[PDB]
């Protein structure tokens, strides 16, 4: 079914759920800290779920990819090889910034949020400050009790504010990853594609201090004991069977202005695609010259490949459903329907007009802003800017610090400086710097107007780029100890420093702060406009009987539907792949190089008792008409009885454009079958201690 | 069903043909000059069929592509535009070498052939000359009557020899080609792929002189009146319907030695695919610069793309079916089964070991032979070598002239020199010379033992190639009138020329002749070994009750089966594509850029009464489990009653490996539906004169 339904919409999807075949009572889903919703956790950008009362967490391989990469070396490459922790003490730290967020409480704070915003009257910066101070105040009151992290979510353009309270587990350990030839089978060739044969799963364990409270990594820490964990299905999942997903989709743009869509399709997607593929060929070449570069940049490369392929996908998607025309059509249809509605229709019209003029800005500057933004986000320079920015914010009292730089954020910044150790190589960073500066100096002179960068370049050719990279090569910020010194340092040490990256951070910061204030003014302007227009778009969608659910905003959503394939002319995609499809794609070479143990078990039909008679084999991946996006990776797929039948990990090629214009005919979630997960762990990359802890052994 | 059955195997397939659903009696098919089989013609490299009593002939677009290309200029591009001849006098000559072969007679000359071979005794070269002298005698005699052309066929490694007598139409004219965006919809992207949306058809007309006798192009010639022509099907083709193809498949390699297959998989296919893809990029680049090079090289580009992609598809198929494992098992099993026979087995085991010797010879110089072979077949150099060779053969009496340089061949040679006029651009030829010369000079010193070429290169780098290409640039063989002059010139005239291409031909010719004699010695050695071994393989294969049929060898074959899709893990390919499928792939960019008329017709559902209610639309292409290969292009697909339901044009991706190891599960023919052809001639690129002549108006 279409829709990323908030839990508070469970009453309107209660009937649809039962009709699709949910056998649980809908009000069992209503208890978000109950069985099974209470087992569903957020990782920040991925979903996971508890699957044992000893804090065992299951997610996708590509979600654990970060943590596996942090633990990998050129010699001991866990991304390539499995990882298995036979005992608690073998489990590896997923790194200082790894999180499990266990939902505690959702509180609607709409009335108070709207009063805070209104209390600022017509001043747009005042409105943004007012909402930010409201956010900070709600978060501070909510985080008063140790171990909780809270977050204010804005729904439906600001028509709804809800304050989420999570227990934040800060000690997450890697328990099991299949080899990358299973976790990532078919690599970037099969990414965003069906048929799919990817065992995209991994396991973490959540830990807490001896005292029960969240704690950073310590040998003393004990497994978290979740109230609720999912059970693997004992009922074989089959074609047409009900499935549902709970998870944390990050962002959809289905309510975007036709103008926002058009910018994205004509500029952002093609430009990012193009530059990412160029950077990717650079990182791949660097990785061939030094395995340590390949490992240290493997998370970036995976992530940029994903985006670049997705962006291409979305572009083909938009051509396939004429998204430009549908956006146009629906926008005009809302504006007309608003006209007929006499009195009450005028404010929404006005709101539209406001939101329109907002597209006008970035026309000549958008390449420049990408190239400078990308240069400023290379490792050494990014760390300099982050560290300098914190030193500035430290001056201010905590409640006036920029979000991301308050006391409650310090541990995350410090953990970022630490993780960079496993993700930084001077020679690779210098090539990224060179690449983005090369794009800047290739701009027309009129667009090459960044005063600071022009000063530091002292020219507009290759030699000028080389000499500035040469100069930035003198930074000491490649040293962890250096970064951790600067982490603590007064803004005056920064403004005095002769470190070329710090000097650059110091020179660019006035511009960055001005750019950020302009961003906040734009957010202020839209804080009454966006909500009134989207309320009208919604009220118009409702009038035509369409589905009304908010755009994804990284909060908890339910989607549901059934296991089913999709069709194109001449092709019917069947809802399941099987072991034989994996073996059939074997080329002996990346990314189609399964472990010999897999090729031998499939040749021997060693199904391990996991074959589905309807398929005549063990299912690997399955399709369903669920509505998931970025953030839903690792989401548990529950059958009619709330049992784990799989993990969400991907969409088919036609689904990627549903981020903008949803297509019920061809949008499918790809999931990894819980049977393939068990099969891998029995027959291929064994995890006997895990099968026992899951009560499958 | 599996097999490319010779007509003489109709007894064995009568039951199967009836089981599959043939309504025609099998003895109807045994009549090769009767109805429908007498409608089916050879084009030489393609199949076609008469579809009117006025000599109208239907074949693929890609078969007519050569003729369309010869009639095309940058200014008036019939490849891109289509072509329609609304009357006889508008029909364009398909060019001097276009032929239609109407089968007259097959006679089995097995015993005479073997006697002529046995009669030569023990010298391999003697046995080569003896079959060649025999071939020529059976041909020169069979070619006695004016209009006729005969060919000696070797079946099953020389276990059978059959003489084909054909009436040779020498005046072929383009009647109709749809636009390239229909004829080659999806271009190299959809080539060898299902689903497929390609209108792959064009119409020729066979002309003879007023006497009724075959003649070259003359304005005075009249349409040939065929004894037999296919009617378009009135019964709509559906899934599971019986279909059969009669056509001229070129070569299959199912009886190849395991070693021959291993050499093809490991060297020939990957190497040709690599160099062909580099040469295609060069041709695309020159074509983009110069519309004149684009049109002149479009036939070459189409062909090389087709082979390059085919070879990659075969390499992928070999791994999917483990072709190497199957060839090694079958060979090992035949060798063992031959030890189980006593005396009965000892000759075949003798023959095997002699065939292995041939493979080691070709190994040593395989790279040199490809690069020098390709260089010697560039346009000016190939013309020089062919022209000088013929002056040499002229010196000799005709009976003693090499196959292809006899009196009966002069017309084709002269044809080739004319057609090159529409297929040559000196600056493209120079890039081809450069490319293949660059591969030669890159070889290790030890492989660079072409004496003449090293003398002519005077170096082994880019600059030495640059200077050989500058020197060969002074040739005049770019002029048609120079070529036709050399076509008539004595051996001495050649030896006198200061034309550098001719001097090269003169210089290299002695080595080409030794290499050709050495090749005739191997062919002589092969003339008794090959039949003995292949008879053993056939014997072993019948013992297992496996289907036994000769490898394709450019002779007439029947294949049959049913309209059906195929499956892959996660995918069920449906047997038809439809109009909406063509519209859904539209991008407004080559190769997915349908005529505006097609999109308009599809968006309006103008099905011009051709809709199949079982599809909800007009069918475009369809799948069937027939056994076709290169040569079968333009083969009529006949329903149960022998009426035309479409034309064979391609195979699915997984089929192409069936050239070496037949895979019944995933081998399908892709045919264009006769309703799509009619639909295109009604609604898109009208041919109302052909709709009338075909009895569809």
Numbering used by the authors:
A (entry chain A), B (entry chain B): 23 to 719
What do the authors say?
The unique features of the Val-Tyr complex are that the bottom space of the S2 subsite is occupied by four water molecules and the side chain of Lys206 is less ordered. In the Tyr-Tyr complex, one of the four water molecules at the bottom of the S2 subsite in the Val-Tyr complex is replaced by the hydroxy group of Tyr(P2) and the side chain of Lys206 is well ordered due to aliphatic contacts with the side chain of Tyr(P2). Because S46 peptidases involve conformational changes upon dipeptide binding, which reduce the degrees of freedom of the polypeptide chain, the transition from open to closed state is entropically unfavourable. For Val-Tyr, thermodynamic parameters were not determined due to low-avidity (Kd > 40 µM). The order of dissociation constants (Kd) of dipeptide (P2 a.a.; V > N > Y > L > F) was consistent with the result of competitive inhibition assay.
Family S46 peptidases are serine proteases showing dipeptidyl peptidase activity and are widely distributed in Bacteroidetes and Proteobacteria, but are not found in mammals. The SmDPP7 enzyme forms a homodimer, with each subunit consisting of 697 residues (Ala23-Ala719) and a molecular weight of approximately 155 kDa. Each subunit contains a catalytic double β-barrel domain harbouring the Asp-His-Ser catalytic triad (top domain) and an α-helical domain that caps the active site (bottom domain). SmDPP7 hydrolyses peptides from the N-terminus of oligopeptides, cleaving the dipeptide units (NH2-P2-P1-COOH) when the second P1 residue is a hydrophobic amino acid.
